[PDB]
Structure 1
Amino acid sequence: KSCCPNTTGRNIYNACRLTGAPRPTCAKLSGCKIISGSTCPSDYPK
């Protein structure tokens, strides 16, 4: 699951995945994190 710290991060993350790129790449680019679990930590709620 992807977890972002703010709306900016979610926006970039989403645009990046729509180009076809891998989740860790899009995470790094956006400041979001990829977790293996189903619930995002509280400081990455977006």
Structure 2
Amino acid sequence: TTCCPSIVARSNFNVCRLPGTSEAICATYTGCIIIPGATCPGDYAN
């Protein structure tokens, strides 16, 4: 599951994913995070 800190970060993440870039690389690129659960925390609300 991916969780993003802000709207901008999520939008950036989605563009990063368009060529098929691994989630983990898009995460460090944007500040989004990958978690094993389905429940994003309040400080990664987007």
Q: Give yes or no for TM over 0.5.
A: yes
Share of identical aligned residues, percent? 46
How many equivalent residue pairs? 46
> Structure 1: which 4+ aligned runs deviate by more than 2 Å?
none
Residue in 2 aligned with 1:15?
15
SS in 1 for 2:12: helix
Q: Distance in 1 between matches of 2:15 and 2:9?
A: 10
Deviations 1:11-41 (A, max 9, x none): 1100011111000000111110000100001
- Give ranges in structure 1 of 5+ residues lacking alignment: none
Q: Distance in 1 between matches of 2:12 and 2:29?
A: 7
Residue in 2 aligned with 1:35?
35
- Give ranges in structure 2 of 5+ residues lacking alignment: none
Q: Distance in 2 between matches of 1:45 and 1:11?
A: 13
